């Protein structure tokens, strides 16, 4: 939801990808300000219909723009996640729903 105050410890639940529920890894923040982990971005966005999976904002030009500049990852957010949940980030780097409405 809102800005994390300076030096505040973020809750785990803010640091989880809202698509896959894993800790956010290499978070990608779309220009509508929704964020998802890079693996989810590749699956649910880059390789699907290039819309934000949260608000359906079109993100095809945004994706070309940043893929070309290798700047997909929100680096400041990624910094903060690894600072506060480093073990979670390591574990990930090691590898009932009535409403199924998000494609692959
Ligand atoms: Zn994810
Ligand atoms: Zn969005």
Swiss-Prot record:
Belongs to the RNF168 family. Sumoylated with SUMO1 by PIAS4 in response to double-strand breaks (DSBs). Ubiquitinated. The chain holds residues 1 to 112 of 571 of the full protein. It comes from the Eukaryota. Monomer. Interacts with UBE2N/UBC13. Signal peptide: none annotated. This is E3 ubiquitin-protein ligase RNF168. E3 ubiquitin-protein ligase required for accumulation of repair proteins to sites of DNA damage. Acts with UBE2N/UBC13 to amplify the RNF8-dependent histone ubiquitination. Recruited to sites of DNA damage at double-strand breaks (DSBs) by binding to ubiquitinated histone H2A and H2AX and amplifies the RNF8-dependent H2A ubiquitination, promoting the formation of 'Lys-63'-linked ubiquitin conjugates. This leads to concentrate ubiquitinated histones H2A and H2AX at DNA lesions to the threshold required for recruitment of TP53BP1 and BRCA1. Disulfide bonds: none annotated. It is linked to Riddle syndrome: An autosomal recessive disorder characterized by increased radiosensitivity, immunodeficiency, mild motor control and learning difficulties, facial dysmorphism, and short stature. A zinc finger (RING-type) spans 17-56. It is found in: Nucleus. The MIU motif (motif interacting with ubiquitin) mediates the interaction with both 'Lys-48'- and 'Lys-63'-linked ubiquitin chains. The UMI motif mediates interaction with ubiquitin with a preference for 'Lys-63'-linked ubiquitin. The specificity for different types of ubiquitin is mediated by juxtaposition of ubiquitin-binding motifs (MIU and UMI motifs) with LR motifs (LRMs). The modification Phosphoserine is found at residue 71.
